[PDB]
Symmetry: C2
Subunit: 61 residues, 2 copies
Amino acid sequence: GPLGDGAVTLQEYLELKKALATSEAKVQQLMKVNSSLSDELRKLQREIHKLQAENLQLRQP
Amino acid sequence: DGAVTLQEYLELKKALATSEAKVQQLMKVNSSLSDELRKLQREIHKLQAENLQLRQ
């Protein structure tokens, strides 16, 4: 980047690099949480399979 | 050189905008995943309650 009197100051450059790093970190965190949530989704779906099977047996006269 | 610095800065701004769009898309899908997990949990609980009623 520039040295600490042009169109882009060193402070502007550093602030932009930090904003990009912050946004990239947030993408990584979103991907980690979405992976965890996607695994949880499958577990909860399986719990419905379990209870649906029980429900159908209980209803059978 | 100031022209080179300007171009580097503008490319970084474009990268930031692209990253922000990706964050917004992943937030959208996070929210949908979260809504669907809450819905499944409510459906599990309704089946659990109905099954216990069928036993009474």
